[PDB]
Amino acid sequence: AEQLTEEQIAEFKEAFALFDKDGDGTITTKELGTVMRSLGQNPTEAELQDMINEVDADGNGTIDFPEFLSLMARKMKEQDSEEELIE
Numbered sequence: 001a002e003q004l005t006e007e008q009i010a011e012f013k014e015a016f017a018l019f020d021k022d023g024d025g026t027i028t029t030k031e032l033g034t035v036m037r038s039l040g041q042n043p044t045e046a047e048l049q050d051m052i053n054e055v056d057a058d059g060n061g062t063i064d065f066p067e068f069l070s071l072m073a074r075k076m077k078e079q080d081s082e083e084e085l086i087e
């Protein structure tokens with residue numbers, strides 16, 4: 001019911017940085033693969049691109065912070081809708 005706050009955005013930027021190791025404002029398939037493997041995953045090279053294209057709104061090949069935030073916003077809107085239904 002509420003849009004992302006400055007503090008939430010700041011926390012999301014830290015999360016973004018966990019993927020974007022070189023801090024160039026993007027998340028590549030390579031960086032994505034590194035994160036997936038750290039969670040017990042092992043997707044394929046081309047399989048990583050599919051996940052990227054799914055979040056990559058401007059279709060430039062990588063994920064930028066705005067698209068990352070958009071996803072987080074959609075997720076929050078989802079949990080908020082459910083938590084308001086659980087009643």
Ligand SMILES: C[As](C)(=O)[O-]
Binds near residue numbers: 001002
């Ligand atoms: C969802 As509200 C805090 O604007 O009532």
Ligand SMILES: [Pb+2]
Binds near residue numbers: 001002
């Ligand atoms: Pb409000």
Ligand SMILES: [Pb+2]
Binds near residue numbers: 007
């Ligand atoms: Pb505060």
Ligand SMILES: [Pb+2]
Binds near residue numbers: 011014
């Ligand atoms: Pb923090």
Ligand SMILES: [Pb+2]
Binds near residue numbers: 020021
């Ligand atoms: Pb990067």
Ligand SMILES: [Pb+2]
Binds near residue numbers: 057058064066067
């Ligand atoms: Pb963008």
Ligand SMILES: [Pb+2]
Binds near residue numbers: 056058059060062067
């Ligand atoms: Pb992009």
